[PDB]
Design an enzyme around this catalytic site. Sequence first.
Site, mmCIF file in Angstrom:
data_model
loop_
_atom_site.group_PDB
_atom_site.id
_atom_site.type_symbol
_atom_site.label_atom_id
_atom_site.label_comp_id
_atom_site.label_asym_id
_atom_site.label_seq_id
_atom_site.Cartn_x
_atom_site.Cartn_y
_atom_site.Cartn_z
ATOM 1 C CB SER A 109 -0.993 0.006 1.180
ATOM 2 O OG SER A 109 -0.342 0.166 2.429
ATOM 3 C CG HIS A 157 -0.847 4.681 3.930
ATOM 4 N ND1 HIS A 157 -1.988 4.285 4.595
ATOM 5 C CD2 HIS A 157 -0.217 3.538 3.559
ATOM 6 C CE1 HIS A 157 -2.047 2.966 4.624
ATOM 7 N NE2 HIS A 157 -0.983 2.487 4.001
#
EC number: 3.4.21.105
Length: 175
Positions: A109, A157
């Site tokens: 991710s 992220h």
Amino acid sequence: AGPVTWVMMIACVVVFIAMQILGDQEVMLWLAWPFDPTLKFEFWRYFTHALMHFSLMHILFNLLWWWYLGGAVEKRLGSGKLIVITLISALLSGYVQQKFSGPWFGGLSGVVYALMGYVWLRGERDPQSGIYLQRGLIIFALIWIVAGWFDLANGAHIAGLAVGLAMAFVDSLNA
Ligand SMILES: CCCCCCCCCO[C@@H]1O[C@H](CO)[C@@H](O)[C@H](O)[C@H]1O
């Protein structure tokens, strides 16, 4: 899908299987970010954490996103472009994750956030080229982001996203 898009997908599946078999712990023992001075110099560990997934849900969506975005970048821009995006985003997100929460982690991710950022920003500043992020898919990309942000780590992220935006900036800056 290119050789880079494919090899990464196949490896994530293979590692995931190794994880179902021997358990997560065992695999992380070898692929996780160095968790002791004694592993300091085992270089694959700065990258291999992106290959481990802990749930069917995660590897499923991560690979869907990787397959769509990674494949598009590699086809229209080349394998080299995808390799650099993956290498830098994997290192940076892995580092930030590591700093605030420890060496026990995994997932692709971080790399996926690099891709969303990159595809979207190039496609907005350099429309012309075929790489843009579909209007509808921006909506579902957001839902996915939301799912993650409100735990339905965020720092790792943003670092991934930051690498992607930076690289699209640089690129949509050439001409
Ligand atoms: C963001 C995805 C990152 C994936 C990075 C994969 C790197 C794997 C490097 O492994 C290397 O393979 C060699 C092959 O012979 C071994 O000899 C060596 O010991 C080992 O270090």
